[PDB]
Amino acid sequence: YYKSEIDKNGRRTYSASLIPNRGAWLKFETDRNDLVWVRIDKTRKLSAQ
DNA sequence: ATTTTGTAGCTACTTATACAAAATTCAGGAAAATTTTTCTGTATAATGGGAGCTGTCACGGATGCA
C-alpha cells in the first residue's frame, strides 16, 4: 500500500509499504529529494539504492 | 416423771501436717537408623538467537545542522 503525505508546507512525499502474509515488511517513500530508501521496519533502513 | 435440758464430762474419734518416699509418669537425648539430599562424571564430534513490530506524544531537545 501507499500512503503519501505532506510536510508542514506542502511537500507531499509518498511512501509505500508491503506486507507479506507472514514475514517482515519493506518500506519506501520520497524525502525532499525525490530519492529513496528501502526501509524495512518503520524506518529500520534507508538506502538511495 | 420423762424429757429435755446439763454439765461437766470423758473417751473414742477424726480430721490436719507434714513428709515422703515412693510411685509414676515424661521429656529429651541420644542414637541410630535411614531416608533424602547432594556431588561428579560422561570421551566419536558438536563452535553465534529470536523476533517483527511496525497507527498518539512531546518535548525538550535537538544536538546537529546545513
- Which residues are CB-contacts of A1 (< 8 A; sequence separation ≥ 6)? A16, A17
Residue nearest to nucleotide B53 (CA to C1'): A41
CB-CB contact of A14 with A2 (8 Å): yes
- Protein CA at A27 to nucleotide C1' at B55, angstroms: 15
Number of residues written out for chain A: 49
Protein-proximal nucleotides of chain B (any atom < 7 Å from a CB): 52-54
In 3D space, the residue among A28, A37, A30 whose CA is nearest the CA of residue A13 turns out to be A30
Method used for this model? cryo-EM
Cell numbers that stand for A20 in this block = 507479506
Helix (H, G, I), strand (E, B) or coil at A6: strand
Nearest to A42, CA basis, from A21, A19, A10: A19
CB of A18 closer than 8 Å to CB of A38: no
Neighbours of A12 (CB within 10 A): 10
Taking chain A, what is the end-to-end CA distance rounded to the nearest angstrom?
20
Range A31-40 contact pairs with CB under 8 angstroms and sequence separation of 24 or more: A32/A7
As a rounded value in angstroms, the CA-to-C1' distance for A15 and B62 is 25
**CA of A7 vs C1' of B16, distance in Å?**
117
